């Protein structure tokens, strides 16, 4: 209800204030790179990010209005898409590189350290390049990240459970109104606004694709046993491994 009472400017201010911090990796440039150490740095980083993501989600308007089981479902479905959108956002000003952390800036060549990873790095770099050429704004980025959280698990969920989906759709309509407001404030013509809205939402399908392709490598036995994985991350991965072929 509080999400529906928000003006577009209030929605933007609340999403900006809810932003998680940028964490540091344990990267040591005096140490050489390997499949295990690269997987170790990224897993440890993702693990610490998950805790901040959980607390960020609670501050996303309309999210706490959902049942605990639905909040768990949305976060299980969207966590990797959310880490990926954050990574491509902070990588925007670094052409040809991925700013995993302020102390961890990686080329596509470093992605060749882990089997199957370079293909994902190429997709993440392409997405980052697309955000850069569109001159994606911080205000738009926070709207997109929130859309990912609310949209990615909405269809994979009695009449009571149906009201939850309706509320998610209403909040998503509010985030769209917010995106258009930002573009109109930026002086775009109506045709430019709709075209930009569409370009941004199509990028979301690419982020879904990257997350699904990445997830498939992460829950494979090779990646699960490459480095000792943390408990929360194992559970988040298993939410996906559960539906995968045996």
């Amino acid at each position: 209800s509080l999400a529906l009472s928000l003006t577009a400017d209030q929605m933007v201010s609340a999403l900006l204030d809810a932003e998680p911090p940028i964490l540091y990796s344990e990267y040591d440039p005096t140490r050489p790179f390997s499949e295990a150490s690269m997987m170790g740095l990224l897993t440890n980083l993702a693990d610490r990010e998950l805790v901040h993501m959980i607390n960020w989600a609670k501050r996303v308007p309309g999210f706490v209005d959902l049942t605990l089981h639905d909040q768990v479902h949305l976060l299980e479905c969207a966590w990797l898409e959310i880490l990926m959108i954050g990574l491509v956002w902070r990588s925007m000003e670094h052409p040809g590189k991925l700013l995993f952390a302020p102390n961890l800036l990686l080329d596509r060549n470093q992605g060749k350290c882990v089997e199957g990873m370079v293909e994902i790095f190429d997709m993440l770099l392409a997405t980052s390049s697309r955000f850069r050429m569109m001159n994606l704004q911080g205000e738009e980025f926070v709207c997109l990240k929130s859309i990912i959280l609310l949209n990615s698990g909405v269809y994979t969920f009695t009449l009571k459970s149906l009201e939850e989906k309706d509320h998610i759709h209403r909040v998503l309509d509010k985030i769209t109104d917010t995106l258009i407001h930002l573009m109109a404030k930026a002086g775009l013509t109506l045709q430019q606004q709709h075209q930009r809205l569409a370009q941004l939402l199509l990028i979301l399908s690419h982020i879904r694709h990257m997350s699904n392709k990445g997830m498939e490598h992460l829950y494979s036995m090779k990646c699960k046993n490459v480095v000792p994985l943390s408990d929360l991350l194992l559970e988040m991965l298993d939410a996906h491994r559960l539906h995968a072929p045996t």
Partner: peptide, 12 residues
């Protein structure tokens, strides 16, 4: 029994 994610979401 409720998972780590459920526990962290539940916390106040």
């Amino acid at each position: 029994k409720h998972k780590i994610l459920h526990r962290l979401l539940q916390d106040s």
